[PDB]
Amino acid sequence: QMIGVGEATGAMDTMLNKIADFYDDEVDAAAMIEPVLMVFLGGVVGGFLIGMYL
Amino acid sequence: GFGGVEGKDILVFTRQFATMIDAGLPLVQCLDILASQMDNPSFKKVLFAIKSKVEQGSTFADALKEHPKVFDELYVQLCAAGEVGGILDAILNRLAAYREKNEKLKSKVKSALVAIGVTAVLLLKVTPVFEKMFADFGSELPGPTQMIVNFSHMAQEYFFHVAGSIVAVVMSFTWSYRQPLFMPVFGPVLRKVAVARFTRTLGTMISSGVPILDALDVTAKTAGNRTVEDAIIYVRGKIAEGKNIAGPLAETKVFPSMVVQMIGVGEATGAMDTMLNKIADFYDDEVDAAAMIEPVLMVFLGGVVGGFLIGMYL
Amino acid sequence: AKGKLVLGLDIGSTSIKMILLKEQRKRGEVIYALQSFGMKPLPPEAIVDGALMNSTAIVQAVQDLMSELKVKGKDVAIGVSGHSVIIKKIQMPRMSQDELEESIQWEAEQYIPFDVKDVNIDTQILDGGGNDATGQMDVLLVAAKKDMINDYTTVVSEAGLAPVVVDVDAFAVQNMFSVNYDVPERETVVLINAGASVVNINIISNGATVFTRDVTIGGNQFTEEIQKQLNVSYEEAEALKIGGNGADADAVVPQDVERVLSSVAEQVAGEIQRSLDFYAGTAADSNFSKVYLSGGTAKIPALFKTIEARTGVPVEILNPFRKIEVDNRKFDPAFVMDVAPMAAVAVGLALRRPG
Amino acid sequence: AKGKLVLGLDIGSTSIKMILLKEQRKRGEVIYALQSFGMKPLPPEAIVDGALMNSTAIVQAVQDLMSELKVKGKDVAIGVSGHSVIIKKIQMPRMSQDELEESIQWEAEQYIPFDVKDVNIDTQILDGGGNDATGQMDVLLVAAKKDMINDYTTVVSEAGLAPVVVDVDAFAVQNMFSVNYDVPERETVVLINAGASVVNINIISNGATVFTRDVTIGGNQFTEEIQKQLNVSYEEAEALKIGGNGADADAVVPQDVERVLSSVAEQVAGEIQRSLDFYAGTAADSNFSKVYLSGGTAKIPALFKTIEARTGVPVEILNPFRKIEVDNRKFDPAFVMDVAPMAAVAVGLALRRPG
Numbered sequence A: 001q002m003i004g005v006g007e008a009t010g011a012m013d014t015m016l017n018k019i020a021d022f023y024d025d026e027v028d029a030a031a032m033i034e035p036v037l038m039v040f041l042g043g044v045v046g047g048f049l050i051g052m053y054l
Numbered sequence B: 001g002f003g004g005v006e007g008k009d010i011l012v013f014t015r016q017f018a019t020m021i022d023a024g025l026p027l028v029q030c031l032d033i034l035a036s037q038m039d040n041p042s043f044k045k046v047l048f049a050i051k052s053k054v055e056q057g058s059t060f061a062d063a064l065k066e067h068p069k070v071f072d073e074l075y076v077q078l079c080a081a082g083e084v085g086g087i088l089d090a091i092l093n094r095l096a097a098y099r100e101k102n103e104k105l106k107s108k109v110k111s112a113l114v115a116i117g118v119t120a121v122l123l124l125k126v127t128p129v130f131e132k133m134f135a136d137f138g139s140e141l142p143g144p145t146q147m148i149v150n151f152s153h154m155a156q157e158y159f160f161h162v163a164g165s166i167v168a169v170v171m172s173f174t175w176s177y178r179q180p181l182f183m184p185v186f187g188p189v190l191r192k193v194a195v196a197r198f199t200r201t202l203g204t205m206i207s208s209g210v211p212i213l214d215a216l217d218v219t220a221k222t223a224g225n226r227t228v229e230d231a232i233i234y235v236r237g238k239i240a241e242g243k244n245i246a247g248p249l250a251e252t253k254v255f256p257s258m259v260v261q262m263i264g265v266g267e268a269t270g271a272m273d274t275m276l277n278k279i280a281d282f283y284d285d286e287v288d289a290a291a292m293i294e295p296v297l298m299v300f301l302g303g304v305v306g307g308f309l310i311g312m313y314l
Numbered sequence C, D: 001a002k003g004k005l006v007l008g009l010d011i012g013s014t015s016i017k018m019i020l021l022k023e024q025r026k027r028g029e030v031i032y033a034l035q036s037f038g039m040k041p042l043p044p045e046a047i048v049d050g051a052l053m054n055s056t057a058i059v060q061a062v063q064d065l066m067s068e069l070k071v072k073g074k075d076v077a078i079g080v081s082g083h084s085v086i087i088k089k090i091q092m093p094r095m096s097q098d099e100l101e102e103s104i105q106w107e108a109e110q111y112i113p114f115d116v117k118d119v120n121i122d123t124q125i126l127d128g129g130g131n132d133a134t135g136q137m138d139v140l141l142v143a144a145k146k147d148m149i150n151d152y153t154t155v156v157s158e159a160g161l162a163p164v165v166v167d168v169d170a171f172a173v174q175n176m177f178s179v180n181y182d183v184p185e186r187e188t189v190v191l192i193n194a195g196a197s198v199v200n201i202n203i204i205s206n207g208a209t210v211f212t213r214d215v216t217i218g219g220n221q222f223t224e225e226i227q228k229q230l231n232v233s234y235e236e237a238e239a240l241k242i243g244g245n246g247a248d249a250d251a252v253v254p255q256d257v258e259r260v261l262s263s264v265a266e267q268v269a270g271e272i273q274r275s276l277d278f279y280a281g282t283a284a285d286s287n288f289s290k291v292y293l294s295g296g297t298a299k300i301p302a303l304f305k306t307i308e309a310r311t312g313v314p315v316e317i318l319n320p321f322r323k324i325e326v327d328n329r330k331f332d333p334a335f336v337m338d339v340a341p342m343a344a345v346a347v348g349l350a351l352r353r354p355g
């Protein structure tokens, strides 16, 4: 939609520069990198406790 | 058997309903908008079904009753109390604040009886149990007594260790309780939370079809932080006078250069709805990442444990 | 659980009346048929402002009704006071029955000057069986402050009765004419029930109620004006009304009485013209058709001709009991006809009870 | 809990009056009927600026009222002082009853020059039973600074009485005429209650109050001018007013007195024209209809003809007691008629009490 505005305005340069900087900042911030931690966090803990239990 | 939805996901949706309803949109149109702005299917799917009951003429409380596994009896009753008294708007604001406090409190035990209650008993006595159990490995440790003393004297000498255990407890309780002149320089200004809420509310009312100025007049009445409310009244006053939205924002430090530059694109593109939706999602995720509430736990966790063990040995 | 219940006129204010129709067998055929009817003047202090406010005395009176009836049945339908019920129409969207009941309570919440703390019951002025999801809902809400209903349930409980339907009089009075209305089905008919505490107007197309309106004025007003102008007690003023206004020898008393009741006559006519004009919303170029009368206040001599000439509608008495079989060996058709207007409702919710 | 309570005229300022109506049985019929009535001149220092400010003395006076009455009842409705109550209309959105009560208190907060610390009670000028959610709310708020109500409750408590309703006089005075008003129902009627501390105007369509307005001027003003112009005490100036202005032998004293009261007459007329003009908001091309008078200040000789010619409305005395049965063997209709204007409210909240 943003590119589609840029086509009609002759401002595709400005549009793409702001899209790119939005993406570059989204990239460097980067949610599944934290949920999968916790999966292995407590999942391993619990595997130990069950391990000797048995 | 059916489960509810995540604490995050109840939060987002209760906030955005409270916001739309307090805007004076029809309840069915509020419902449509949040469904249509949702990222998970299960939310968009339910909210179409809740809206389908509301268009048959049922109350919101009775429409949410189709999902008792998601909206518990206490939630519906709050809604229904608001509907019976003519205060649906202010009980939804209350529920949105409630859902926000609930999600924040969840992240923040877990990070590093529900799960929070079971994990909080379990962390509060882990160490002091360790402790009692090293001090129960036989007799004649560091600092003990022989068992033949009279009990009262034995117990009083150990008072050291009974004390180091209680202090250990108090600490892990503190981490669980906390953790979930220029006079104007001292006032709390806008935070990350308050910008994320603002952006979500505006992204929400624009995606629904409200103009910018109608959305700002609603938002300026539903902003919690007083300094931000003063900021937003100034932004709305500037825009209503014919100044460009990105230029009213650029006067206020709380909006980064990227936010303003992105909004300034959205003005020329008729895509502000979505510029705001992507800004808001970015902020909501930055908020929920913001991590020192879990590292400082662990500092006091093992630091106290180790202080006990050192204490008697010496 | 199926019995043929019974029916009292609990909000008679002037009179507690009760009727037992069941199915009477004759020659191997059966049908709804009058079995008994009883009437007792209501001892006052029983009812005030439409609430039952001496549940004990009313209990004993209803027991006297059951004994005079010689009826073994102990289940009952009854009615609330017109002063105790808010009846009005309400526009919604139809949907699920729960969503309707909630949405109904939500809209009428606006309509009720009391906490709820309030009775809500709706029925749809048009068959729901006619419209699509989200569209064309119309319900009429009967709302009643809570313990009018309580008081009546206490009265019913200690009389040994068990209530199954607590209906409203403006529509219960119609069940006797609902057939004769159902035969002309584009005809607009008015039904006036002039009682002692209230006068109800309900206007219909067929036996499909279009609206209802309740007027505080009633026969108690005529009696009270007689009492005022001749410093009489309520009873002797009431008799002076009844026998005074209608005897063949009454030639000297319609000046003395009619001059007393003339204000009430004018002002009742003003109220009825009032309501009729407040209805005529859609047909600005039409006229009326035909109308009936019920309640004893109607039986004021010549009042039917007066309402007929004054409202521009033919106003006629009607015999309810035509809806039910009447054994001539147990009931005189003449007397039955005489007490028909008072008893219209009294057989009304009574056809509601073997229904 | 059901008794038939009682009714005093607690804010009489000139007189504490009390009335007992209950349901009197005659010939097996019963109805609301006057049982007793008593009147005592208020000992001053009891009331100042509309607050009960010698709760003890007022207590003993009310006890004298109960003894003169020979009444066993100990429950009471009463009224606040017109100087102690703010009455005005307020526009809102109807909704839930809690949301209305809160929103009402929120809007009237603006309306009250005292902390709350203040009594709020509303009623809707139109049946809530007429409008949809969020729309067409109108309540009228009666607001009273707190311990006017306290003072009155202390007075009631040590008199052995138990209050059930603390009503307001401008509407309590209307319950006696509420029927006779309810019969003409598009007619605009004015009701003036000229008391000793205040003159209330309430104007209605039917018995549906359209508005009320309270004027500081009253009979105390006439008495006070008589006292000024002849250095008399308040009592002898009051008697000179009463008997002086109305006797058949008074031919020499309406110059001496009328020249004293002429300023008050002009200026009262000016206040009443004032309020009437301040109402006429919507019908710029209409006129008035008919109006009644209550309160003893009305009974100033010829004052009714004066208000009639001066305000352009027919102003008539009215007999309240027509609303209640009166046994001629226990009460003279003539005297009852004579003390009717003073007693209008005194039977007012008294029909409020068996209600």
Ligand SMILES: Nc1ncnc2c1ncn2[C@@H]1O[C@H](COP(=O)(O)OP(=O)(O)OP(=O)(O)O)[C@@H](O)[C@H]1O
Pocket (backbone or CB within 6 Å): C009, C011, C012, C013, C014, C015, C194, C195, C196, C197, C198, C199, C218, C219, C220, C223, C238, C241, C242, C243, C245, C246, C294, C295, C296, C297, C298, C299, C300, C301, C341, C342, C343
């Ligand atoms: N012949 C008559 N002439 C005039 N009035 C009559 C006559 N017969 C009965 N009434 C009046 O009709 C009233 C009783 O009629 P009815 O029993 O039908 O009313 P109701 O149903 O008891 O009253 P409501 O339902 O309004 O409480 C009494 O007020 C009585 O004075």
Ligand SMILES: Nc1ncnc2c1ncn2[C@@H]1O[C@H](COP(=O)(O)OP(=O)(O)OP(=O)(O)O)[C@@H](O)[C@H]1O
Pocket (backbone or CB within 6 Å): D009, D011, D012, D013, D014, D015, D194, D195, D196, D197, D198, D199, D218, D219, D220, D223, D238, D241, D242, D243, D245, D246, D294, D295, D296, D297, D298, D299, D300, D301, D341, D342, D343
């Ligand atoms: N015949 C009369 N002529 C002139 N004035 C009279 C007459 N009778 C009574 N009044 C005046 O009427 C007043 C008392 O009337 P009433 O008892 O109805 O007022 P109130 O209800 O006691 O006063 P309020 O309610 O304003 O405190 C007194 O001021 C008295 O002077």
Ligand SMILES: [Mg+2]
Pocket (backbone or CB within 6 Å): C009, C011, C012, C169, C195, C196, C295, C345
């Ligand atoms: Mg009836």
Ligand SMILES: [Mg+2]
Pocket (backbone or CB within 6 Å): D009, D011, D012, D169, D195, D196, D295, D345
């Ligand atoms: Mg008075």
